[PDB]
Design a protein around this ligand. Structure first.
Ligand SMILES: O=c1ccn([C@@H]2O[C@H](COP(=O)(O)OP(=O)(O)O)[C@@H](O)[C@H]2O)c(=O)[nH]1
Ligand SMILES: *[C@@H]1O[C@H](CO)[C@@H](O)[C@H](O[C@@H]2O[C@H](CO)[C@@H](O)[C@H](O)[C@H]2O)[C@H]1O
Ligand SMILES: *[C@@H]1O[C@H](CO)[C@@H](O)[C@H](O)[C@H]1O
Ligand SMILES: O=C(O)c1ccccc1Br
Length: 444
């Protein structure tokens, strides 16, 4: 009972959730964990604090308003390193006299500066990569090559420019984020271990490649235990949400009244914004189906005028936020029109829901390439090269490819092989269970 992990996610939903899920696994294995949330995120959730995972607050330098009150991404990341370094140190110091002092920092790989704090205090230090091995390996090759990528990549020759992370195909876009994803590797060799939110059997070749450069430990998927291995019965869902849902049994009750495989689920995660023009092509394409579409509140204005009040309440539903795990497990879902965020992707793969891939930016084009041509679990929507927009007829065609065709019948069979592979990996003797055991042993 000696070890104590302080877990520091990048402060977005897609990073907080896999960190929190990993903490529930460590707790089941007997390791105490404290999750570090920024003050702004803490004061927006109002989390429940009678749980097996404690919460500490740190500062990114923007406690009042959060990221949206920062001038720029570069200012934000630099203030986060300043304020985060000082406030992580503060948490460590505050726990020193305690029964269980902090012994280990599991920090988001996006934040390599946390390793320096961990090393100043003599702690175990491990970066946690929330993106899959293939993406991280590609970023690692570019970091080694001063930020450039010569296609083709000898070890992954099937990758084309349009399959790379958007930083490589959209020149100069988001330079602060591009620098951040490359600098994940500035010191990762010096960590005790390198953790990855994936499972070995999903990316055998890429995991093998990346491990030659640095031993990594796959400890995923971070899907709650009740849906896969079921060894942790208290792990029944995602219980740290930055977005409010209208308590929606209403959403799952509505899907219960629908025929099997008949509903098109559409969602673009927590962050990605589509333009007016892209929302128009989408709204038109999906209106040819029974659909369940999450449109985030801030995105509603970009819908075509009067769209929300001409959804026929019998076949279709538009939500502000969904219980996506429960949706993706419901039998009424025929396919998942997704932006290919890695959590939505792994959730789709493991629930056996075939995908329509509409990637937007950072690593999503990679996940989209793997969904279609490696895991063969869906089709990527075609976007016009000059305009960059996926037009309504191309979106409707891709959904039909996944719902009905001969392609369709194949991608169903292929996507259900992955649930069992993950269950095996999380069960005793599996790849992920052993790797988590190795990490727990080192921490205590
Ligand atoms: O309406 C929604 C949309 C997304 N999610 C969850 O939010 C996470 C989104 O993470 P992902 O890596 O897919 O995308 P990001 O939001 O980081 O771009 C996932 O755990 C989804 O299940 C949800 O619960 N309800
Ligand atoms: C990364 O930069 C982009 C802007 O290019 C931001 O959208 C993102 O900020 C996140 O926004 C989310 C709201 O949709 C918040 O949940 C999250 O806390 C915040 O970090 C930047 O991180
Ligand atoms: C950065 O750019 C993408 C568009 O390519 C958008 O989806 C994100 O919302 C934005 O932060
Ligand atoms: O890679 C991601 O998904 C990501 C998430 C949040 C903020 C920045 C990025 Br670049």
């Amino acid at each position: 009972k000696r070890g104590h992990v302080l877990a520091v996610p990048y402060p977005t939903q897609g990073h907080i959730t896999p960190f929190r899920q990993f903490c529930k696994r460590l707790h089941f294995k007997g390791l105490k964990t404290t999750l570090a949330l920024t003050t702004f995120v803490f004061n927006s959730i109002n989390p429940d604090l009678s749980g097996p995972i404690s919460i500490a607050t740190i500062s990114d330098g923007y406690d009042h308003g959060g990221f949206e009150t920062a001038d720029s991404i570069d200012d934000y990341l630099k203030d986060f390193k300043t304020s985060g370094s000082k406030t992580i140190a503060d948490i460590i110091q505050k726990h020193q006299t305690s029964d269980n002092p902090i012994t280990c920092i599991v920090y988001d790989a996006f934040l390599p500066w946390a390793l320096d704090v961990a090393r100043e205090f003599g702690l175990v230090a491990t970066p946690f990569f929330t993106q899959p091995c293939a993406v991280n390996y590609v970023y690692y090759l570019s970091y080694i090559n001063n930020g450039s990528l010569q296609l083709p990549i000898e070890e992954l020759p099937f990758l084309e420019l349009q399959d790379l992370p958007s930083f490589f195909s959209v020149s100069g876009s988001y330079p602060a984020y591009f620098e951040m994803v490359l600098q994940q590797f500035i010191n990762f060799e010096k960590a005790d271990f390198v953790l990855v939110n994936s499972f070995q059997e999903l990316e055998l070749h890429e995991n093998e490649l990346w491990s030659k450069a640095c031993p990594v430990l796959t400890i995923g998927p971070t899907i709650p235990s009740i849906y896969l291995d079921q060894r942790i019965k208290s792990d029944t869902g995602y219980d740290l949400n930055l977005f409010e849902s209208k308590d929606d049994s209403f959403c799952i009750n509505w899907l219960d009244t629908r025929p099997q495989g008949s509903v098109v689920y559409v969602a673009f995660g927590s962050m990605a914004q589509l333009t007016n023009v892209q929302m128009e092509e989408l709204a038109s394409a999906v209106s040819n189906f029974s659909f369940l579409w999450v449109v985030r509140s801030s995105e509603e204005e970009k819908l075509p005028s009067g769209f929300l009040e001409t959804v026929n309440k019998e076949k279709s539903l538009v939500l502000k936020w969904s219980p996506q795990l429960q949706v993706l497990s419901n039998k009424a879902i025929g396919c998942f029109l997704t932006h290919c965020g890695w959590n939505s992707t792994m959730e789709a793969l493991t629930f056996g829901v075939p995908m329509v891939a509409m990637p937007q930016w950072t690593d999503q084009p990679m996940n989209a390439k793997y969904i279609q041509d490696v895991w063969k679990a869906g089709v990527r929507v075609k976007t016009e090269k000059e305009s960059g927009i996926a037009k309504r007829e191309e979106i409707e065609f891709s959904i039909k490819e996944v719902m009905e065709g001969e392609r369709s019948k194949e991608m169903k069979k292929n996507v259900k092989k992955w649930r069992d592979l993950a269950v095996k990996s999380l069960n005793e003797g599996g790849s992920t269970d052993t790797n988590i055991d190795t990490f727990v042993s080192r921490v205590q």
